[PDB]
Amino acid sequence: DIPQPIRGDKGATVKIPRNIERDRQNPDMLVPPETDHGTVSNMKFSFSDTHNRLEKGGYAREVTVRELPISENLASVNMRLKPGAIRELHYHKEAEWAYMIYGSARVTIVDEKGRSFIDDVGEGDLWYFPSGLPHSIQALEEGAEFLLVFDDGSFSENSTFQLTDWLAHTPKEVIAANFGVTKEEISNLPGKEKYIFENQLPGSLKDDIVEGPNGEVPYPFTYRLLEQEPIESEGGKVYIADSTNFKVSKTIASALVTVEPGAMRELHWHPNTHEWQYYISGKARMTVFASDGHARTFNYQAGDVGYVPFAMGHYVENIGDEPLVFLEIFKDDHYADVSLNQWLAMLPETFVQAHLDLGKDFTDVLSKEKHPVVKKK
Template sequence: MEIPKRNQGMYGNVPQPIRIDGAGGIDNGPRDIMRDIENPNMLVPPITDSGLLPNMRFSFSDTSMTLSHGGWSREITVRELPIATTLAGVNMSLTPGGVRELHWHQQAEWSYMLLGRARITSVDQNGRNFIADVGPGDLWYFPPGIPHSIQGLEEGCEFLLVFDDGTFSDLNTLSISDWFAHTPKEVLSANFGVPISAFDHIPSEQLYIYQDNVPGPLESQQVQSPYGTIPQSFTHHLLSQPPIKTPGGSVRIVDSSNFPISKNIAAALVEIEPGAMRELHWHPNNDEWQYYLTGQGRMTVFTGNGTARTFDYRAGDVGYVPFATGHYIQNTGNQTLWFLEIFKSDRFVDVSLNQWMALTPRDLVRNNLHVGPELLDYLRKEKWPVVKYPGFSYYPKNTN
């Protein structure tokens, strides 16, 4: 049966693994049709895909929720996405007044606020404290071993946490309630110089997240330390940062150059308009961990030796790109695609394929690729992280 071009890859309203040239065939067996609709480039891979690459996509929707009075959390680590060895992510929500209890990690913690507002507190090894409120688009960063807490304000909050170790689990962190529960009360009494009875009602196990009252104004909770406050802010207002604007979108880069405390994690917030793409590029410093905020897109990763694979992404998905491998991300929807690129590094760096070619002797590029002035005359010496040209758009589903 001939498949009309406009329904290429479709049979009725059901997507099918068929290319426009007839390659493939009808799948009448048991299948998850909704999953195939969400992953058209896995059902019908581009003809340029080749070889075997591990999975580089996992959705928070496919993870297990930890539900508490006061909020919830879910995480993506190497258990869910084995290739993601450098970073792990936690998606967490706190109710109004909900508290992620006083705790610390052996890993660095980097966070992006998604919704609502929260209050964070911390004290460093020198007794200098930090208390601040954060809202949508704000970041915080706590170095390894620095104790802190997070509490939802009037409207509650939701945020992304990223840790610089792919094996990390937020359920295995060091919490104050857990330590108290596993320390003899006579030791607690001696440590604090108070009667044992002061610990009659301490929790018997880790609280993790608990419900409390919404705290008062920030000024009402300030605690003066005799040693002063943290010299480098633990927060950064990313959306207040002027973006790098290019045709088709924008990029905001944040690393230790403009967020000095963030020594272990660097990131970029990328905006790709419909019909635009994150240009062909790679990162020479470390693997890339991605979190998709809005919209939908597709990414092809090229690892050399004739190997490439394409993945589809939607809001709430995590993507991953191995160190120094080529890739690009296209907006495949009709709304703006926003996502975070995150690295275990103190600096954000990337190499642009276009810029590399423009700054290489013209004859060398021409003879290497067998191309002419229709390409060579349009190479850019300036880097455009996001590109869009008149007439450029993502082609309809499965016209690969």
């Protein structure tokens, strides 16, 4: 039950003190496929290996370019809110995309024309807040836990502007002049940020809707991803949300992938941009093919972030007994992939045979229809 880095006549037993628990989580890294080769950047990081900021009302932990340097364009926060607790009104330079994993929450956003959008989001729903637009989150009666993705990997403390922090660092006489009140009237303003704070549960959504002289926002900032019809194939399902259906989501394209036991996200690549991954549940392995005979295999499980640099070939195999559920995230205005199977199926069979040194028995199995998740025979 003690694994060793041995493959046939290659490798040897570990002779120094070691981390057996981590080795058991990484079987394809302690003993990689013999087809791996060459230097490839790290493509895997666990939220469990990050500092958790604890507050009255919840917590937040992040995986950024300071943890996973291959991911320069995207960063992520795992945030948790207790029932009624508020993530303080704030904004960022980055656009923010979110997936609700557990529970439910009410969000607010106001746009640059002064129009307000207030909505409740449940498990499987998304939101997207464009760069610089101010927003808040308040958990409902079950609390909430969700994944935030920001479209800059350097996301840091310097990215986020909190309402009470701004006011605490503005001269009181200027605040008073701004609103037409006296300094005495604003003397009870907080002296520092709140960030996350406890609060009574709100009332019904309909009671919170604020009417305004500038009308309704043209497009909603939330999306019910799991209410859409997925792409179904023999081994699982894919739900896609990008700017073509979730109209406001102009800089983030996303897919939720479910892979049954014994199934795999097929060999494919993305012709548009890098892939950022979050593993919601289950256990996987992925080989990233990096060109020029370079390839490296990684293991993932719940709580891990993954990455596939622009156009590298890859697959995602379920290596456990439970369903594998993960997100594919892209900094682009649409989702796009090329399927290895479909590519070859759409070429003259003798041309494919000339490449692969295989016969009609192989080209006969190719499918001109794309099946993103396939089931083992």
